[PDB]
Write a protein that binds this ligand. Structure first.
Ligand SMILES: Nc1ncnc2c1ncn2[C@@H]1O[C@H](CSCC[C@H](N)C(=O)O)[C@@H](O)[C@H]1O
Ligand SMILES: CCCCCCCC/C=C\CCCCCCCCOC(=O)[C@H](O)CO
Ligand SMILES: CCCCCCCC/C=C\CCCCCCCCOC(=O)[C@H](O)CO
Ligand SMILES: CCCCCCCC/C=C\CCCCCCCCOC(=O)[C@H](O)CO
Ligand SMILES: CCCCCCCC/C=C\CCCCCCCCOC(=O)[C@H](O)CO
Ligand SMILES: CCCCCCCC/C=C\CCCCCCCCOC(=O)[C@H](O)CO
Ligand SMILES: CCCCCCCC/C=C\CCCCCCCCOC(=O)[C@H](O)CO
Ligand SMILES: CCCCCCCC/C=C\CCCCCCCCOC(=O)[C@H](O)CO
Ligand SMILES: CCCCCCCC/C=C\CCCCCCCCOC(=O)[C@H](O)CO
Ligand SMILES: CCCCCCCC/C=C\CCCCCCCCOC(=O)[C@H](O)CO
Ligand SMILES: CCCCCCCCCCC
Ligand SMILES: CCCCCCCCCCC
Ligand SMILES: CCCCCCCCCCC
Ligand SMILES: CCCCCCCCCC
Ligand SMILES: CCCCCCCCCC
Ligand SMILES: CCCCCCCCCC
Ligand SMILES: CCCCCCCCCC
Ligand SMILES: CCCCCCCCCC
Ligand SMILES: CCCCCCCCCC
Ligand SMILES: CCCCCCCCCC
Ligand SMILES: CCCCCCCCCC
Ligand SMILES: CCCCCCCCCC
Ligand SMILES: CCCCCCCCCC
Ligand SMILES: CCCCCCCCCC
Lengths: 95, 280
C-alpha cells in the first residue's frame, strides 16, 4: 500500500441487501475513516458511519436489491496537513 | 517509568551530555570553523548511531536513535544561540525549542499512555507539505538574515516568541497529564470502555487545551525566527487544521458522552479564536 490515500476499494462479498467492502489502507497512519454510501443519483442524502483507522473493511446493510450504489471512503490523518480530511476513493456497485 | 520511556530518557540525556562535552571542548579551544564543528559533530553522531544499534534491538533502537537525535539538536541549538553571530543566534533557540517539543511529546505519552508508545509519539511529520513548510521557514530565515541581518538581531522580538512557545508548551503538556489515558495523538471514533469526559483543570478553561498550546506554540516558533512571511502562513495553516480536526473530533465526543458534552460546549469554548466546533 504505497499510496498515501485509501486504494483498492472493492466489494468483497454481497447479498441482495448488504455489502462487505474492503480497501487497501494507505502507507500513512490513519486516525479514522468515514464511509458514505448512497443510491447513485438518488434524491436522498447519503449515509455515513465511522470505522477505526486500524481497520480496512466495513459492512453496509439495509440496501435495496438491484439498485446502483456509490460508496466513498474518507481517511482522516495528520499526514494530510494542513488538511485533516483526505482525498476520497469511490466505487460503484449494483445490488 | 515505562521501558520505552526509560530508553528515550537515557538516550536523550546521554546524547545531550555527549555533545555538551564536545561543544564545551570546541568552545574553550577556539575551534570556530563551521565545517570543523560540523565534522566533529558528524564524527560522533556516527559513533552514537552504532553504539546504540549494538545495545538495542530493532524496536528499542528506533526509539533510542530518535531521542538521541533530538538531544543532539537541543545542545547544538543552545550552542548556536550562545556563540554564533547575532545574525544567527536566533536560529539556535528555534532548534532547541523544536527538539524539546518533539521529545517531551514522546515522554508525555510514555508517562500517560505506555500501552501505545511508538516512534509516532515523537509526532514528527514526515508529511511532504508539512516538511516543505518547515524547510521554507529555514530558507526564509537564512535568506532574510543574509540580506537583512538587522531583522534577526531584534532579540527582544524573538524572545517574545520564546515566551509564547514556553507557555504553549506548558499548556499542552499539562493538558496531556490532565487527560491521562483519555488523551491520544490519534482522534478516536470509537468509545473505549475506560474513556471518560474531562472537564477539570485546563479543560475547564478550554475544550481543546492541547490544541490551543500547539496552535500558539507553532506561531511562536516563527516569532522566534522573526520570519514575517511564515508567521501569518503558519497561523492560517495551523488554524484551518485544528478547525477541521476539532469539528470531526467533537462529533465523536457527542456520540460518546451525549448531553454531558453538549453542556460542556455551552460552558467552555474551544480556546482557539473563530473555531466553534461541532455546534452552532
Ligand atoms: N474533554 C475531553 N475529555 C476526554 N477526552 C477528550 C476530550 N476532548 C477530546 N478528547 C479526546 O482526546 C483525543 C484527542 S487528544 C486531544 C484532546 C483535546 N482535543 C485537547 O486539545 O486537549 C480524542 O480521541 C478525543 O476523543
Ligand atoms: C547513552 C545511554 C543510552 C543507552 C545506552 C545503553 C544502555 C542500555 C540500557 C539498559 C536497559 C535500561 C532500560 O531500562 C528499563 O527499561 C528497565 O526495564 C527498567 O529500568
Ligand atoms: C558521556 C560523558 C562524557 C562524554 C564521553 C564521550 C567523549 C566525547 C567528547 C570527546 C570529544 O572532544 C574532543 O576532544 C574532540 O577532539 C573534539 O571535541
Ligand atoms: C551544515 C549544517 C551545520 C549544522 C551544525 C554545525 C554546528 C554549528 C556550530 C558552529 C560553531 C560556530 C563557532 O563560532 C564561534 O563561536 C566564534 O565566536 C565565531 O567567530
Ligand atoms: C533575556 C536573556 C536572553 C533571553 C533569551 C533566551 C533565554 C534562554 C537561552 C539563554 C542562552 C542564550 C543567551 C543569548 O541568547 C541570544 O543571544 C539569542 O540571540 C536570543 O536573543
Ligand atoms: C512557569 C511557566 C508558567 C506557569 C503558569 C502557571 C499557571 C498560572 C495560572 C493559574 C494558576 C492557578 C492557581 C489559582 C487557581 C484558582 C482558581 C479559582 O480561583 C478562585 O476562585 C479564587 O477566588 C482566586 O483568588
Ligand atoms: C497561559 C495559560 C496556560 C499556561 C500554563 C498552564 C498551567 C496550568 C496550571 C493549572 C493546572 C490546573 C490543574 O488543577 C488540577 O488538576 C486540580 O483540579 C487542582 O485542584
Ligand atoms: C517550567 C515548568 C513550569 C510548570 C509549572 C506549572 C505546571 C503545572 C502542572 C500541573 C499539571 C497537573 C496535571 C495532573 O493531572 C493528573 O495527573 C490527574 O490525573 C488529573 O486527574
Ligand atoms: C505526525 C503528526 C504531526 C502533525 C503535524 C501537524 C500538527 C499540527 C499543526 C501545526 C500547525 C502549524 C504548522 C506549521 C508548519 C510546521 O512547522 C512547524 O510547526 C515547526 O514550528 C517548524 O518551524
Ligand atoms: C497570532 C494568532 C492570533 C489569533 C489567531 C487568528 C486566526 C485567524 C483565523 C481566521 C480564519 C477566517 O475564517 C473565516 O473566514 C471563516 O469563513 C469565518 O470565520
Ligand atoms: C526529566 C523528566 C523525567 C520525567 C520522569 C517521569 C516519571 C513518571 C513516573 C510515573 C510513575
Ligand atoms: C549547552 C551547550 C553548551 C555549549 C558551550 C557554550 C559555551 C559558550 C558560553 C559563552 C557565554
Ligand atoms: C525570502 C525567501 C522567501 C521563501 C520563503 C517563503 C515563505 C512562504 C511560506 C509558504 C509555506
Ligand atoms: C543550521 C545551523 C547554522 C549555524 C550557523 C553558525 C555559523 C557560525 C559561524
Ligand atoms: C546551513 C548553513 C547555514 C550557514 C550560516 C552561516 C552563518 C555564519
Ligand atoms: C537547519 C536544520 C534545522 C533542523 C531543526 C530540526 C528540529 C526538529 C528536530
Ligand atoms: C499520576 C502520574 C504523575 C506523573 C507526573 C509526572
Ligand atoms: C526519516 C529521516 C530522514 C532524514 C533526512 C535527512 C535529509 C538531510
Ligand atoms: C519538522 C522537522 C522536519 C525535519 C526533520 C529532520 C529530522 C528527521
Ligand atoms: C535542508 C535545507 C536547509 C536550507 C537552509 C537554508
Ligand atoms: C541583483 C538585485 C539584487 C537585489 C537584492 C534585493 C534583496 C531582496 C531580498 C528579499
Ligand atoms: C525590550 C523592548 C525593546 C523595544 C525597543
Ligand atoms: C486563546 C483564547 C482566546 C479565546 C478563544 C476562544 C474561542 C472559543 C469559541 C468556541
Ligand atoms: C489572543 C486572543 C485573540 C482575541 C480572541 C477573539 C475571540 C473572537 C470571538
Amino acid at each position: 500500500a504505497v499510496s498515501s490515500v485509501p486504494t483498492k476499494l472493492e466489494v468483497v462479498a454481497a447479498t441482495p441487501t448488504s455489502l462487505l467492502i474492503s480497501w487497501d489502507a494507505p502507507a500513512v497512519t490513519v486516525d479514522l475513516y468515514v464511509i458514505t454510501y448512497g443510491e447513485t443519483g438518488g434524491n436522498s442524502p447519503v449515509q455515513e458511519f465511522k470505522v477505526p483507522g486500524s481497520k480496512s473493511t466495513a459492512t453496509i446493510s439495509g440496501l435495496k436489491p438491484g439498485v446502483d450504489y456509490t460508496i466513498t471512503v474518507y481517511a482522516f490523518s495528520s499526514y494530510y496537513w494542513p488538511s485533516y480530511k483526505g482525498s476520497p476513493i469511490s466505487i460503484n456497485y449494483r445490488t | 517509568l515505562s521501558p520505552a520511556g526509560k530508553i528515550s530518557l537515557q538516550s536523550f540525556t546521554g546524547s545531550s551530555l555527549v555533545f555538551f562535552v564536545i561543544c564545551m571542548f570546541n568552545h574553550y579551544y577556539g575551534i570556530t570553523n563551521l565545517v570543523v564543528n560540523t565534522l566533529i559533530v558528524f564524527f560522533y553522531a556516527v559513533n552514537v548511531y552504532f553504539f546504540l544499534k549494538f545495545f538495542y534491538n530493532e524496536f528499542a533502537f528506533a526509539i533510542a536513535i530518535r531521542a538521541a537525535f533530538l538531544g543532539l539538536v537541543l545542545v547544538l541549538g543552545l550552542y548556536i544561540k550562545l556563540v554564533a553571530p547575532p545574525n544567527i543566534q536566533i536560529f539556535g533557540g528555534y532548534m532547541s525549542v523544536m527538539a524539546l517539543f518533539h521529545y517531551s511529546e514522546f515522554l508525555a505519552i510514555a508517562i500517560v499512555q505506555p500501552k501505545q508508545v511508538s516512534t509516532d509519539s515523537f509526532v514528527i511529520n514526515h508529511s511532504p507539505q508539512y516538511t516543505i513548510a518547515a524547510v521554507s521557514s529555514w530558507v526564509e530565515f537564512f535568506i532574510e538574515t543574509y540580506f537583512f541581518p538587522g531583522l534577526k538581531e531584534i532579540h527582544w522580538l524573538s524572545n517574545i516568541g520564546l515566551c509564547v512557545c514556553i507557555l504553549g508548551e506548558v499548556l499542552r503538556k499539562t493538558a496531556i497529564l490532565t487527560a491521562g489515558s483519555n488523551f491520544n495523538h490519534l482522534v478516536q471514533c470509537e468509545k473505549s470502555s475506560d474513556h471518560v469526559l474531562v472537564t477539570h483543570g485546563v479543560y475547564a478553561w478550554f475544550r481543546h487545551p492541547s490544541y490551543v498550546g500547539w496552535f500558539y506554540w507553532s506561531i511562536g516558533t516563527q516569532i522566534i525566527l522573526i520570519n514575517p512571511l511564515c508567521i501569518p502562513a503558519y497561523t492560517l495553516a495551523s488554524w484551518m487544521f485544528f478547525k477541521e480536526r476539532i469539528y470531526i473530533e467533537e462529533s465523536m465526543l457527542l456520540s460518546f458522552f451525549g448531553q454531558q458534552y453538549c453542556d460542556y460546549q455551552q460552558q467552555v469554548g474551544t480556546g482557539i479564536p473563530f473555531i466553534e466546533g461541532y455546534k452552532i
